[model samples]
Target: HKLVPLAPADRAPAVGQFWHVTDLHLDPTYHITDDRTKVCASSKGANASNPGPFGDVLCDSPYQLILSAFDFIKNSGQEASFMIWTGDSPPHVPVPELSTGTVIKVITNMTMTVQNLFPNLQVFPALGNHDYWPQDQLPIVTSKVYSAVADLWKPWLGEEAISTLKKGGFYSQKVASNPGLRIISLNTNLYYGPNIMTLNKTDPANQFEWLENTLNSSLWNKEKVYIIAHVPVGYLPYATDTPAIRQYYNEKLLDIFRRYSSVIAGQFYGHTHRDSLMVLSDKNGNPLNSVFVAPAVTPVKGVLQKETNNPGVRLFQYKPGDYTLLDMVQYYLNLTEANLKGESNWTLEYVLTQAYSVADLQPKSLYALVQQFATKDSKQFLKYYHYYFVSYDSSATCDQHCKTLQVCAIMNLDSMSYDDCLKQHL
Candidate 1:
């Protein structure tokens, strides 16, 4: 059977696709020879029975996995308009082992890999919390690491963007293909929990000021902007049940998003390492924009026992002229099957528009879907729960209590709103 595209058949010609690959978490020391019982000596966790050459659920990406993924992407023959490479290049391990030099090396290798694979494609990248030395400890002042990264990303970001990136790991660039659109790559780590630099600080790195100014200028210039970042600004979807970003920062960020929702095209983020999204609402509680959280390339698990996502990449279809997202096609590697067969098979998992029966990947459409998820026996919610893990474990269960939290998290972005959302349901 032929699959339906997001847009109507007549409007298909106006759509273009782009790649969103995040959380590569490439561990250079991830060798098949390493003891799988000990974080693979470089990956995330331990206790793997028979890990494959590519990767294990408990570990990060081996060199072969990254290679296979890039190969699959190149072989797919989809000429993406551009690529958003949100960060977290390094693996999840002890912070001390991840020094300034290692972080830089990991990022450098990842950058070069993308450049080599998509030589002519314009790649917009962001700084993940793990991108810095001693992970998640990004300071307010500029550092040598930031400058080095700025120089490294110069080919894709150019001179002006690099200047801001060097100053505070954030930059905004006018998309050359569509001069009326801009890509705002942010280093959201300054708002991360572990970042002591942001404690009690109002407007760390002066990003809020710059962000508003940039949005205002974009609106004045009649251009739309896509804000891409690593650490998403919303409530974490786990038992932790706290804001993914710091409280004050998330509040300020949400305010800016609300004020400039008119010029904001969309929000793309990673770092949760799961296939998830948050709906941005207006002051009147009307859904205005949506934040699309791309899954990670790494199959590493979180602190929670079942918190593991399959290695995945996303291809987003959108209007080239306006840059409004039309649909998303998610691709994943079946880790267990690949390990059993001693080979990798990165294949299409699902298309958002087709799977959810949504007309488009717009805020209103997605929020309506979220409402359906609130129902007691929703087939759409079941499908979403499966995709939440990137189909890592199809049989995994989410009881009603779990469902309530997840639904509330999806409906709210800031901490207070999320709290209120849960209060009604609880």
Candidate 2:
């Protein structure tokens, strides 16, 4: 037998892997036994369960949980070529009372910490709805807040990216170390609903124009592109834009995807804390984009809401040369389970492709997956639900009926019926 090198190459040839951490909502002021008006954590004072979910106030990541998460990532022995940090750096707490200076400090400190953790980690972060001061209050392109945030993000984005980001908080970077890869991080808050920036200014950032231009250039260069953002532009009942509007948005983006599906490799995003996915389709209804939205580190819940998911993170493996999909590894910690077991339990729960039996994670596999959802391929779809929106307890997860509804809802997301299920469920 011929002798082969025991060590593999960095990220290996024709293959690349990365870590996706999002919706940190890192509240530096979280407390375990006490409750502050500005903090979000399971409190002893409230009637709700401890270490479970938060109250009516802004629910989000505790400082300790973020520390634990970083520790887990570094110690896990997994190496990533680079990292995608889909943002929401600030907490859900009252941003009105919080000064702009506080927001800056929070972002500045967190950015520095991420830089310090990995020796050779390349981090690509995007702007989120909560990243601004006053939480969901996003500023105009020319506002002081936009300039301040753009100034602070310089070291990571570099000269070219910073030039655009300073104007609109969206930027792009090329992976010089890696071949044929371009990263576009856009500020999605402006397009979001109830966002004052939308009313305040007509052209919040000219992001869409820049994005079109950026994609046009990538096509010319024969480069593989990855679009990263916080709020994903897709049709979902819970999304900021109306279902029809979101559908229209999808059609608009699909015009680009239809032509440049080869150049556009992947979409990474996070906003809804649940471990969800947005399947993007071309004008003719071909599945072309898969937006992998990672779960949150904080299990924040509304005061009136009765549901909260476990905290989780994701690791993705993709084809380097062609940039096709491979597999996604989901890591999570069960807060309720941790409290029951008397420890903070972090785990590499499962690999998505294997867990859901969506063998390859490409258009073919994902399309089949959507078919299963519409058709209720009971065996495979059940497994997908169990792992997709995982619970601390195996038996306590989403039931088959709930799974069916969720699947059917994906069929006709705007309606309670599955009238359009077969049209393009997959």
Candidate 3:
């Protein structure tokens, strides 16, 4: 049930909803980085090596598409209490033209657009890898980019978030003052392999250690927490991350999750533009964490796979203190198919609980998905693959070849039988 609307700047209601948006990858200028854009300019993942380093422009979400999505969300009737933005304010291209000042300009412009549309909603944003000019190059100490971003967020995130961001680009804030629910926004860029600052141990501060401490404080206060990060801890074949990074970050992070799973009820992350879910378990294989990877707003062209993924967004229905998630709905636009016809079409893809027939969004439901993989459930695999890849076809179905790749994609979670899914009939 929808709670009474809380004041715009006040804490969220005890029972309220929130929106999840990530990887806008807004090009704004429609910079043609290669032949991919020449064919379909606004197409998401139009090219894998298509949008690389940029001095002037590169392939990314066009201003028109971005505006469309913003307007669509405003009128979607989701009426979220607020939103958790999982980063990637800049396009996925290293643009020399992108200085800290220009970065701030784009950020401010985007944030302003958001505020203009949802005037009363507060936004909690995490720093993404693309947010940096030289992609993945976050400094060890307080840098100008961090300073500008912190200031940009202070108006919405307040002093605490601003202070923490200035220190290390991570911060915490109470989401609902009634239940004392809290959120810790993480700057996952530091954990990525390419972030030169992370190479050395002395600097960049200890975000994980700090996160552990944050969890402890939240635990001490007996408050429920929602952890938002740009780049998540699990599954990496698509990224430049090394196995060491996974063990050091995702695995170590899962340990903390097991220890404080009760304290942490929600784990939200992005960077993977695909619509996906990940279950994090403890050393004993007991499921303790669940990650909801929100789909991107841009259908970015990939390097290896030239497949299509509809840009998507989600509205999560949850209560303030009690952790068992209520319901969530995913909204997406068929970019690949729409571009072929005429206008881009955004529609509700599926409802989480309804589609899976789960009672609640908990570790059990996520593990159940992995369990389906274990049982050789062919229909289950096909359904997941269709929605996961966001097959833009009106039927929302995938062929045998597509299902095969989806099965392979599931094997990389690392929590399950890695590569074993390949051998399964599903």
Candidate 4:
């Protein structure tokens, strides 16, 4: 697939524009005490626990990726006014008693590393479920979990960031001084319980109500707003067959998004270790543009043979009237011969190619199209597709060409060499 050319120089955002990065899943100390025992000897079934290889590699990959991102910004010669991290910095699984404190320390170090790279830029962080849960259990907000997590994050992010988190992890801030746009960050983990087994009493009623009131009071006329969160809502493919318990909470969250019009221009999230996009509409059936989900930096250790790409990062740009999502730039750690070994390089190509081919046949029969082009079975393809495309109103014509072009651009980046990948492809 050919890469789409960058937008004309005249169309690019100003030097001080802001962008986001989410779901880096940076585990500073992979935390797997015994690899063989954790993965092979353990009696625990897959459902119980299956810790794979490279568990401790989290610290390395995220460190590299963050430094690389900063280098990209500095070398590009564009002044990145600010950067926002929407959570899941470290996958501190089997959550500890002081789970909140562990996450805060890791995140703080991450911020410090970024500052060391770009001393002038500001950073903002949001909370994720893994950081709050002591185990996989639910009702994360009622306990002192969030408070401890917030206390740690606040000092690093400052009062403005603290104020934003206080409003139920849902708050808006201006991007600039003159005629600037607003960026809204939402804490999806706080609203619903882990695994959808239960709802957080504190969230559904209070947080939802607070969001509505915040949007209404802000009166953000003609300002562009991007919703940043860690978990995706309503678009999960299995939602149709979701256990009755989870479906209830899913619908509840969807209902709230449907109520507000000005609150969302684009939604950004991470959790699933795949790169994809989805578009949901408002209650009145108006399209809410696109929601971009980023890929993970850490590779799926034992599953490498089953997948082709390495982990990667996404780059985006937004102008006053036009918003553009640049292709995901894959990063490879080790290279030998012509092939590179890293998650970003291989995964970005595979997903982009799949998304592009599927987009080309849009408006066609969803089942028939999948059978013709996808390796996934009809049921599975539909499941994956619905996670992103379900919100397309039946009345709306599919933008096949536009989407295909975007995917093609991503594919082109995948073909470039590791050292020159982002610079050459982007």
Query: Whose TM-score is higher: candidate 1's or candidate 4's?
Result: 1
Better of 1 and 2 by lDDT: 1
Q: Clashes in model 1: which pairs? A: none
Candidate 4: worst-modelled 10 consecutive residues by lDDT? 410-419
Compared with the true structure, what per-residue lDDT tens digits does model 2 show for residues 286-346?
A: 6776666677777776666546667788888887666776999999887766656555667
Ranking of all predicted structures according to lDDT, beginning with the best and ending with the worst: 1, 3, 2, 4
Model 4: residues with Cα > 4 Å off, grouped in runs: 1-17, 30-79, 96-98, 133-161, 164-167, 193-202, 220-222, 238-245, 282-286, 301-309, 321-426
Question: What digit string (tens of lDDT, one per residue) describes model 4 on residues 230-341?
Answer: 6665433222122112445445655565555445555667655455544444433234445566655443323212231234444454443433332223222221111123
Cα error, residue 238 of model 4, in Å, equals 7.2
Q: How far in Å is the alpha carbon of 237 misplaced in model 2? A: 5.7
Which candidate leads the pack in lDDT?
1
Instruction: Report the CA-based lDDT of candidate 4 relative to the real structure.
Output: 0.45
Q: What is the lDDT of residue 124 in candidate 3?
A: 86
Q: For model 3, which pairs clash?
A: 44-299, 44-300, 44-301, 45-299, 45-300, 45-301, 46-301, 48-302, 48-303
Scored against the true structure, residue 358 in model 3 reaches a CA lDDT of: 76
Off by over 4 Å in 2: 1-14, 34-48, 52-59, 200-203, 237-251, 340-342, 392-405, 408-419, 422-426
Question: Which of the two, 3 or 4, has more TM-score?
Answer: 3
Clashes of 1: 0
TM-score of each: 0.94, 0.84, 0.83, 0.61
> What lDDT score belongs to each candidate, Candidate 1 first?
0.86, 0.67, 0.70, 0.45
Writing each residue's lDDT as its tens digit, candidate 1 over 1-426 gives: 577666545642767788999999997876665556663655445565458888877778888898888888989977787888899988888987779998999899999988898888888999998898888988777887798889888888878899889989999998766668899998899999899888988888898899999999999999999999999987887754688887788888998998998899889999988999789886456898989999999988643576588899999988878888899999999988888888889999999999999999899999998999988889999999899999988789998788878888888887767877778887
Error of 2 at 78 (Å): 0.7
